[PDB]
Design a protein around this motif. Structure first.
Motif, short mmCIF file in Angstrom:
data_model
loop_
_atom_site.label_atom_id
_atom_site.label_comp_id
_atom_site.label_asym_id
_atom_site.label_seq_id
_atom_site.Cartn_x
_atom_site.Cartn_y
_atom_site.Cartn_z
N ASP A 52 91.49 -71.80 -39.80
CA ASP A 52 91.58 -73.24 -40.01
C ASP A 52 91.00 -73.63 -41.37
N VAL A 53 89.92 -72.97 -41.79
CA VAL A 53 89.32 -73.27 -43.09
C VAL A 53 90.28 -72.87 -44.20
N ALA A 54 91.05 -71.79 -44.01
CA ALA A 54 91.99 -71.34 -45.03
C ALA A 54 93.08 -72.35 -45.32
N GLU A 55 93.39 -73.24 -44.38
CA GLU A 55 94.50 -74.17 -44.55
C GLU A 55 94.20 -75.30 -45.52
N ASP A 56 92.96 -75.44 -46.00
CA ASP A 56 92.65 -76.38 -47.08
C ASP A 56 91.75 -75.82 -48.17
N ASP A 57 91.16 -74.64 -48.01
CA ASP A 57 90.41 -74.02 -49.10
C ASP A 57 90.28 -72.51 -48.89
N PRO A 58 91.22 -71.70 -49.40
CA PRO A 58 91.02 -70.25 -49.35
C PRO A 58 89.77 -69.78 -50.09
N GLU A 59 89.37 -70.48 -51.16
CA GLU A 59 88.16 -70.09 -51.88
C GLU A 59 86.93 -70.22 -51.00
N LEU A 60 86.89 -71.26 -50.16
CA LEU A 60 85.78 -71.41 -49.23
C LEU A 60 85.76 -70.28 -48.21
N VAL A 61 86.94 -69.86 -47.74
CA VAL A 61 87.02 -68.73 -46.82
C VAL A 61 86.51 -67.46 -47.49
N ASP A 62 86.89 -67.25 -48.75
CA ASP A 62 86.40 -66.09 -49.49
C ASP A 62 84.89 -66.15 -49.65
N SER A 63 84.35 -67.32 -49.96
CA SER A 63 82.90 -67.46 -50.12
C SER A 63 82.18 -67.18 -48.80
N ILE A 64 82.75 -67.65 -47.69
CA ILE A 64 82.15 -67.39 -46.38
C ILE A 64 82.18 -65.89 -46.09
N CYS A 65 83.35 -65.26 -46.27
CA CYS A 65 83.48 -63.84 -45.95
C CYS A 65 82.59 -62.98 -46.83
N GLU A 66 82.33 -63.41 -48.07
CA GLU A 66 81.50 -62.63 -48.98
C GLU A 66 80.01 -62.87 -48.77
N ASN A 67 79.62 -64.05 -48.28
CA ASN A 67 78.22 -64.47 -48.17
C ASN A 67 77.96 -65.15 -46.82
#
Ligand SMILES: [Zn+2]
Lengths: 217, 173
Positions: A52-67
């Motif tokens: 659900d987060v990916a549907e408006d910010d993939p960068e936020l998903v990347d930041s979550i997955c990395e940190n």
């Protein structure tokens, strides 16, 4: 680098504004509904989906997955700051009385937040969890070899002082901690009163804890 | 008195010395020196000897030592032991009722709403209702270390009696 305050505000925006057309096209704000339920204490756990987060910010998903731990804390803080907007047992009684004294955020926090992993991440085997994935959100398959009984883990310890009648709080993060002995409040220290602290298991926040061991197929 | 740590009327070293003086008859020579007018220069020395003879004794107890005192003191010792034991039992029961009948770690804490702590909030009490029944605001405290130059004086002696035979001899003397 990251500006985690702006990240918190963006997380608040996502939680406030996301909708997914559940129940055959009712346009439900799923996270708003779950925020209402958390505020009313009819629900305790909130599994936010990074799909659900990916549907408006993939960068936020990347930041979550990395940190992931940092963003778990940020999501929890954003939810706690947003619960009064959607606010239309023993620890509840203690939180009520502490609000009376106001009339320890982690203690007053009576919910929990988790990331349901994104489908783009392949589910790894245990052997593929390399050292490069430390501190990162990973999906791992395996057989549950062994499970311990559910035990209480101290999250925020609460003490009461005998001499000055003051509550003191000790948030817990590490698997071990030093229990407080002598009272730190200035009315005890300045008067050299020799007041000591007694743990109040009733008025301190525990959490269900369980240790298990997974194993490769 | 670490080695002479001896009970009510057991013969001390001083008692045995006095009994030896009695048996040797030197007490009669001291009496002769004190009663005789011919050699009064020794009267001061004989006064010193007598003053050193009588140290544990006091005259009011010494004059009342009749020949039948031993049987009386047997019964008196039994009575004193009885009252001492009963007193200790009573003190034990007062302490037992002061504390509760639950174990030490049986927790629970109370607030006394009408009693301010040393701060602005009410006092939180932890030692149980049975300690609250006779509440004192110094239950958990220790005494103060008063300095050496401020401490009170104390008795240099405690009243162990000499042996009854020695008491009879000293009364006769
Ligand atoms: Zn205190």
């Amino acid at each position: 680098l990251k500006d985690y305050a702006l990240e918190k505000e963006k997380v608040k925006k996502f939680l406030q504004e996301f909708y997914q057309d559940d129940e055959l096209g009712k346009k439900q704000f799923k996270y708003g509904n779950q925020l209402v339920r958390l505020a009313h204490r009819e629900q305790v756990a909130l599994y936010v989906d990074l799909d659900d987060v990916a549907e408006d910010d993939p960068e936020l998903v990347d930041s979550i997955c990395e940190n992931a731990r940092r963003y778990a804390k940020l999501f929890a803080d954003a939810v706690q700051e947003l619960l009064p907007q959607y606010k239309e047992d023993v620890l509840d009684v203690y939180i009520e009385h502490r609000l009376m004294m106001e009339q320890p955020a982690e203690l007053m926090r009576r919910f929990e937040l988790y990331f349901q992993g994104p489908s783009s991440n392949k589910p790894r085997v245990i052997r593929e969890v390399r050292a490069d994935s430390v501190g990162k959100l990973v999906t791992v398959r395996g057989i549950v070899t062994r499970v311990s009984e559910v035990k209480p883990k101290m999250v925020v310890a609460t003490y009461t002082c005998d001499q000055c009648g003051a509550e003191t709080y000790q948030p817990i993060q590490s698997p071990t901690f030093m229990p407080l002995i002598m009272c730190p409040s200035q009315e005890c220290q300045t008067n050299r009163s020799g007041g000591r602290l007694y743990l109040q298991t009733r008025g301190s926040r525990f959490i269900k804890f369980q240790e298990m061991k997974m194993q490769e197929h | 008195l670490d080695q002479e740590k001896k009970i009510d009327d057991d013969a001390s070293a001083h008692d045995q010395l006095l009994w030896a003086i009695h048996l040797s008859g030197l007490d009669d020579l001291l009496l002769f020196l004190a009663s005789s007018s011919a050699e009064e220069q020794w009267s001061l020395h004989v006064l010193e000897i007598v003053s050193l003879m009588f140290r544990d004794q006091n005259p009011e107890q010494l004059a009342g030592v009749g020949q039948g005192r031993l049987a009386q003191e047997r019964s008196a010792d039994f009575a004193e032991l009885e009252v001492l034991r009963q007193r200790e039992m009573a003190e034990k029961k007062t302490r037992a009722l002061q504390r509760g009948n639950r174990h030490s770690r049986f927790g629970g804490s109370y607030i006394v709403q009408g009693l301010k702590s040393i701060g602005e909030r009410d006092l939180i009490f932890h030692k149980g209702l049975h300690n609250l029944r006779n509440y004192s605001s110094d239950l958990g405290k220790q005494p103060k270390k008063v300095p050496k130059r401020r401490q009170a004086a104390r008795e240099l002696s405690i009243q162990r009696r000499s042996a009854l035979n020695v008491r009879l001899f000293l009364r006769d003397f």
